Amino acid sequence: GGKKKVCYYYDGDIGNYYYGQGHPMKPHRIRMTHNLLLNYGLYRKMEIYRPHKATAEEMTKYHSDEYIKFLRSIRPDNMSEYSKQMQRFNVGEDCPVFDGLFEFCQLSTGGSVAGAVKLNRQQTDMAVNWAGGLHHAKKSEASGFCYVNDIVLAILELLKYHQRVLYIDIDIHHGDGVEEAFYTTDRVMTVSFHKYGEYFPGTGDLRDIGAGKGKYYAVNFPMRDGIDDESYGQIFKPIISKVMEMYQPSAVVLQCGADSLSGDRLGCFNLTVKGHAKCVEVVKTFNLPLLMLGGGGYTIRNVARCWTYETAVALDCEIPNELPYNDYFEYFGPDFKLHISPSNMTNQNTPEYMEKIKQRLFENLRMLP
Numbered sequence: 001g002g003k004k005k006v007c008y009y010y011d012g013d014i015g016n017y018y019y020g021q022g023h024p025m026k027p028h029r030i031r032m033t034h035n036l037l038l039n040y041g042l043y044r045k046m047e048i049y050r051p052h053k054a055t056a057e058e059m060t061k062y063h064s065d066e067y068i069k070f071l072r073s074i075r076p077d078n079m080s081e082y083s084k085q086m087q088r089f090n091v092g093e094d095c096p097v098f099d100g101l102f103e104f105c106q107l108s109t110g111g112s113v114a115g116a117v118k119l120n121r122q123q124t125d126m127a128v129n130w131a132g133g134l135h136h137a138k139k140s141e142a143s144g145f146c147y148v149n150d151i152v153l154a155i156l157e158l159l160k161y162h163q164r165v166l167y168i169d170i171d172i173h174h175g176d177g178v179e180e181a182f183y184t185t186d187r188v189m190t191v192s193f194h195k196y197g198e199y200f201p202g203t204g205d206l207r208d209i210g211a212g213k214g215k216y217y218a219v220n221f222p223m224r225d226g227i228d229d230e231s232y233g234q235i236f237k238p239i240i241s242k243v244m245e246m247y248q249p250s251a252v253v254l255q256c257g258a259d260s261l262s263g264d265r266l267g268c269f270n271l272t273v274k275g276h277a278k279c280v281e282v283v284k285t286f287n288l289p290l291l292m293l294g295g296g297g298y299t300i301r302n303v304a305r306c307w308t309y310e311t312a313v314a315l316d317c318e319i320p321n322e323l324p325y326n327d328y329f330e331y332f333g334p335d336f337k338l339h340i341s342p343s344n345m346t347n348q349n350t351p352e353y354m355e356k357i358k359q360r361l362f363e364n365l366r367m368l369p
């Protein structure tokens with residue numbers, strides 16, 4: 001299918017937004033990612049863009065005016081005046097008020113929407129925004145470290161020129177905000193693989209399939225702890241191939257949350273960077289306009305490895321396992337390699353379990369026209 005044009009979205013300020021002491025979400029991992037892929041020489045093979053700050057108008061294509069007005073006004077110095085609005089909008093604990101919160105939203109969002117525009121104009125084959133993928137944000141509520149749903153906004157942009165858009169979520173968490181936004185439409189099919197059971201957000205049961213015109217257009221693959229490259233790989237390609245066959249999207253959004261990697265601080269999966277990136281390779285074979293977004297990921301050396309390698313995959317560019325020198329080199333010890341090993345943790349996802357869920361999903365996919 002050829003090497004593809006890749007446009008990549010990054011703002012150097014992004015790494016300076018700070019969720020607070022102890023908060024596992026570290027925007028600095030996006031800067032670590034950028035610096036690593038600069039030092040691999042990958043800027044030579046792609047267009048690097050500094051995205052615009054998305055305006056309140058752009059955000060209110062999905063989010064309510066009142067919620068965006070709040071995000072735009074709330075600061076640590078006036079939180080006291082806003083205690084009621086904070087509880088209503090779920091801001092102040094998991095989704096804290098931090099300095100520059102709204103600008104972080106604007107730059108995260110701006111990358112995804114700019115990427116979608118560039119794909120619409122057929123000026124690129126792929127667009128990458130590792131500051132995006134904030135799948136949990138709802139119309140009028142922050143959730144799961146997410147305030148603005150850049151994904152829903154980017155998909156709404158895509159829907160101006162694309163009758164059918166496919167969203168695929170390989171973050172360990174269910175892509176609930178994206179699913180919810182598009183639950184009653186057949187113009188977006190949402191496909192999420194995630195741990196399910198005693199795990200945030202609590203949604204993404206197999207039996208959640210959409211409603212109304214969107215019935216059979218939400219697909220959820222619930223999983224247990226310890227899924228490995230082989231088990232994930234044996235279901236991701238068959239499922240996505242059947243989705244592509246049945247749904248025939250003209251554009252794809254892939255959320256590449258790296259908390260599905262082995263050794264993630266918050267995750268419980270056992271994928272390597274190659275196992276994760278194989279999803280990008282599979283989606284790439286269909287030769288559809290593709291927006292690649294970030295997501296979760298909490299062992300930040302592994303996040304930078306993962307998204308560097310997946311930029312290389314987008315570019316069809318082999319990179320050495322020997323990490324180049326970079327501003328964060330010491331974070332990659334003791335090995336200073338790109339690729340990671342899986343752990344000895346038990347795969348609770350039996351081969352029969354994975355095949356059974358697959359077959360149920362296949363029954364649901366038959367129900368498309």
Ligand SMILES: CN(C)C(=O)[C@H]([NH3+])CCc1ccccc1
Pocket residue numbers: 025131132133134135136143144145146171172173200257259266294295296297
């Ligand atoms: C624990 N938790 C909710 C997660 O891991 C989500 N998948 C992360 C979503 C996200 C991505 C980027 C910035 C903010 C929030």
Ligand SMILES: [Ca+2]
Pocket residue numbers: 169170171172173174175192193194
């Ligand atoms: Ca997911």
Ligand code: NA
Pocket residue numbers: 182183184185186187188189190210214217218
């Ligand atoms: Na849908």
Ligand SMILES: [Zn+2]
Pocket residue numbers: 171172173257259295296297
């Ligand atoms: Zn996650």
